[PDB]
Amino acid sequence: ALAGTIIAGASLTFQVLDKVLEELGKVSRKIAVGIDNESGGTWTALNAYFRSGTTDVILPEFVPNTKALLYSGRKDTGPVATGAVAAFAYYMSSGNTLGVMFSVPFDYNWYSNWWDVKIYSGKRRADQGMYEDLYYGNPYRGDNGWHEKNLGYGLRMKGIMTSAGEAKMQIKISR
Known part of the structure; x- marks a missing residue:
C-alpha cells in the first residue's frame, strides 16, 4: 500500500496522492494526505483523532527530514451520511507539535472542504480540542488553490486541498 508509508519528499505529487485515493476502494468520501517534511529534522507520529470517518492505516511512525508521509482517511462505510474529518499530530525533533486538520463533509450544498496546519508548543496529542482550534x-x-503562511518557530507551510468528495491534500513544511 501507499498510505502509511514514507517516500522521498521530492516525489510527492498529485498522481501519488490519487493512487492513495484509489487504494481506499469504493467509498464516496475519502482523502489522501501527503506532508513533505523539509523542516530540517525528523518527526515522530503522535496520534490521529477522527471526528468523522475512519482510517485503515497507521500514521507513518517516523518521518526523517526530506521525506514525505502518506496517509488517508474515509467516511464510515455503508448507509451512513458522514464524511472524513480529523486532526492528527506529529512531534517534531524541535520539541513542538505539528497539528494538521482536514474536513471533508458528506454534503457540499452548504458545506465545503476545509483544512489547516499549526504548530503547538511541546508534545500535544490530537483531540477534539485541536480539531476545534484548527477548524474554528x-x-x-x-479550493484547489495553494496557500502559504508562516507557522512561527522559523517554519512555514505551503499546501493545497482539493474541493471534491475524493480529496487530495499536499503540504510542505520548510525551514
Whole structure:
C-alpha cells in the first residue's frame, strides 16, 4: 500500500496522492494526505483523532527530514451520511507539535472542504480540542488553490486541498 508509508519528499505529487485515493476502494468520501517534511529534522507520529470517518492505516511512525508521509482517511462505510474529518499530530525533533486538520463533509450544498496546519508548543496529542482550534480558527478552504503562511518557530507551510468528495491534500513544511 501507499498510505502509511514514507517516500522521498521530492516525489510527492498529485498522481501519488490519487493512487492513495484509489487504494481506499469504493467509498464516496475519502482523502489522501501527503506532508513533505523539509523542516530540517525528523518527526515522530503522535496520534490521529477522527471526528468523522475512519482510517485503515497507521500514521507513518517516523518521518526523517526530506521525506514525505502518506496517509488517508474515509467516511464510515455503508448507509451512513458522514464524511472524513480529523486532526492528527506529529512531534517534531524541535520539541513542538505539528497539528494538521482536514474536513471533508458528506454534503457540499452548504458545506465545503476545509483544512489547516499549526504548530503547538511541546508534545500535544490530537483531540477534539485541536480539531476545534484548527477548524474554528481560520482554516483554508479545499479550493484547489495553494496557500502559504508562516507557522512561527522559523517554519512555514505551503499546501493545497482539493474541493471534491475524493480529496487530495499536499503540504510542505520548510525551514
